[PDB]
Paper text:
TGF-β protein monomers are biosynthesized with an N-terminal prodomain of ∼250 residues and a C-terminal growth factor (GF)3 domain of ∼110 residues (3–5). However, the GF remains strongly noncovalently bound to the prodomain, which keeps it latent during storage in extracellular milieus. The structure of the pro-TGF-β1 dimer reveals that the prodomain dimer surrounds the GF dimer. TGF-β cannot bind its receptors and signal until it is released from the prodomain (i.e. activated).
We introduced an R249A mutation into the RHRR249 PC cleavage site between the prodomain and GF domain of human pro-TGF-β1. We determined a crystal structure to a resolution of 2.9 Å of human R249A mutant pro-TGF-β1. The structure contains one monomer in the asymmetric unit; the other monomer of the dimer shown in the figures is a symmetry mate. In the uncleaved R249A mutant 2.9 Å structure, we can trace the electron density for the polypeptide chain up to prodomain residue 242. After seven prodomain residues and the N-terminal GF residue missing in density, the trace of the GF begins with its second residue, residue 251. Residue 251 is present in the solvent-filled cavity between the arm domains and the GF in the center of the ring-shaped pro-TGF-β1 dimer (Figs. 2A and 3 (A–D)). Eight residues (positions 243–250) linking the prodomain to the growth factor domain are missing in density, consistent with the need of flexibility to fit into the catalytic site of the PC protease. In the human R249A mutant pro-TGF-β1 structure, the latency lasso is displaced up to 7 Å by a lattice contact relative to other structures, and two residues are disordered. The R249A mutant is a model for the structure of the pro-form of pro-TGF-β1 present during biosynthesis, after folding is completed in the endoplasmic reticulum, and before cleavage by a PC protease in the Golgi. We therefore concluded that the prodomain arm domain is connected to the GF with which it has no noncovalent interaction.
Author numbering:
A (entry chain A), B (entry chain A): 3 to 39, 42 to 61, 72 to 242, 251 to 298, 311 to 313, 319 to 361
Write the structure that this text describes.
Amino acid sequence: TSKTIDMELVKRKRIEAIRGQILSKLRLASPPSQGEVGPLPEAVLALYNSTRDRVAGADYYAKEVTRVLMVETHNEIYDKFKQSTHSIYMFFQTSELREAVPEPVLLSRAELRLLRLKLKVEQHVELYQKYSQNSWRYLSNRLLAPSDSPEWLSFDVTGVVRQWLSRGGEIEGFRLSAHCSCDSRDNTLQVDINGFTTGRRGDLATIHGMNRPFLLLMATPLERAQHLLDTNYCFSSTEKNCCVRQLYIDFRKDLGWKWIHEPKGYHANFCLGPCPLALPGASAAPCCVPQALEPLPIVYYVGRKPKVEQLSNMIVRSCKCS
Amino acid sequence: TSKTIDMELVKRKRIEAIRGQILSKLRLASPPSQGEVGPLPEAVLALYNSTRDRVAGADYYAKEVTRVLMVETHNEIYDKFKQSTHSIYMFFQTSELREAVPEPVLLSRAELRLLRLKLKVEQHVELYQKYSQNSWRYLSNRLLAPSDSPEWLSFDVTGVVRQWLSRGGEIEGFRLSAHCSCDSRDNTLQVDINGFTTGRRGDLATIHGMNRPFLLLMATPLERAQHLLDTNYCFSSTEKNCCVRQLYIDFRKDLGWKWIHEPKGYHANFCLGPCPLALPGASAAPCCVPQALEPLPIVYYVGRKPKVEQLSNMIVRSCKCS
Ligand SMILES: *[C@@H]1O[C@H](CO)[C@@H](O[C@@H]2O[C@H](CO)[C@@H](O[C@@H]3O[C@H](CO)[C@@H](O)[C@H](O)[C@@H]3O)[C@H](O)[C@H]2NC(C)=O)[C@H](O)[C@H]1NC(C)=O
Ligand SMILES: *[C@@H]1O[C@H](CO)[C@@H](O[C@@H]2O[C@H](CO)[C@@H](O[C@@H]3O[C@H](CO)[C@@H](O)[C@H](O)[C@@H]3O)[C@H](O)[C@H]2NC(C)=O)[C@H](O)[C@H]1NC(C)=O
């Protein structure tokens, strides 16, 4: 009767809020048209598919998504890196990476994606960044699960691509090689090579044809680009917006407590400010709520025995509207 | 005049909220006493110090903090692992680990801590978990920064310690060994050993005397223990508390939009419910706000050229009170 509609009304409220959320995120005053193009082309479907199932691991405005495939194997130059059975090389032309992203500042997230298909043994791999000529800098670690069905893998390589877009040669790239562990005893050193158990190399990742390694990019488009953990505080913002008000709390002066031996006081902060769609969560009631929270360790005695305990979420480091 | 006091009143409000926050987090109806014990003993000061500067990287109720030093080197057994110049071994007695934590379920966070002092060259290290007898299972990776002043290091080892407390032998431990990289070409294999550049072993980490490797533990005490990313939804909670109401939004039926080619609709969810101190943020205005948020990739045409973009924070996966 009443309550039923009373909730259908609230749902209908956010539908008009999301209608404003999507348009404001796109910097669009009006909904556009369908476009000139039956079914969509497979170049954007593969790009949309690549984005639908994000693996592993947040600006408000929308981000343009583009992918750039690496230069084909047995094409251009593989002369330097021949006969490395346990290492897969990937190289990208910076001219076509700059074609996707006009300026390094626009890039917000870049992730290299590969296609693994092995199902029997796990593979421990490593990722390296090329420096100068044939000098390699370690990036990240990754273990591979024995999945019968192929699953995509991603590597967060944003900071590297931003340096590539800004300067350096036109040919930059990565190197996915096997992880080894070595423990030495009594003048004898054992090397346990892990990952790339099959010498074919083509058994671990897909390197020929379509579905080859590419570099997925997420950047702000240039039309949007115009205008547009770090602590936030109310004095530095110079605005009435939601911020962090610092409040030192003494246990002796404020709470009147004497039982906490350490610390004598701590910087408990709180949020404050009104949240006003052109002016992020698009909820039915935006609030000034904290985002970042640190714990607070304290010391006190319980009878004869002291206790050192940590209280979670006692200090506010950053607020936000939602 | 007015506004000044009007803000001092709000600050005084949260002081009584934090007064309830700290006591409710400790399950204390009243503030306790100072205790039987001038300056505090150095055993809890080192334990309080260990907690004050947490490095690297959230239950509501307080967590008991205890540390357990590893068995002394050149003491008990080091016979098996002698002459491993690039590997530091650490072993803990499970009887005294069970002395700190009575049941594996109580343990919420465990972190092994070491003391590094090198300043010249960076050290790339690895961490391993002992399996059976002299079988090692990789845990995590870590690079070490050349700091002139010593800095503490931590390793999240919670899942391992919980398995140790539940079953297994009484002597379990870890192994911190150097990371090596190996790239093979033309029947020649190069091994670049990184970390532990000095053969002294005692140059990288502190292994004798006090400030030796210990295992920091954070668990719920047994007196508190009685009673007390996974998606949350309003139908499953069976309560009026703040939860997630699912709402499928069709672009054709609800928004009337036809320009988004893919997807045809998405599961935009919203938060709802009243937040009621015995009944987490302890702010001046608790709100039902979302915690987990996923992006939403969409596809649409701009004139002749299509665009595939991702909109951040469009789907709500979990709400919370703050
Ligand atoms: C990208 O992912 C989409 C789905 O997210 C894939 O779309 C799929 O395309 C196939 C066409 O080969 C569809 O099969 C069709 O099934 C219907 C029955 O529903 C049948 O009548 C048709 O004759 C055809 O067999 C499939 O349904 C469709 N997936 C979904 C969920 O509708 C697409 O193929 C992927 N593209 C790439 C390049 O990975
Ligand atoms: C654990 O950390 C605490 C600080 O977080 C350390 O407390 C420090 O203890 C020394 C005593 O050796 C204090 O020095 C004192 O300075 C005052 C002047 O303020 C002087 O009058 C005294 O004669 C003495 O020299 C030092 O101030 C104090 N730190 C602070 C911030 O007050 C403690 O030593 C650490 N313990 C361990 C085991 O690491």
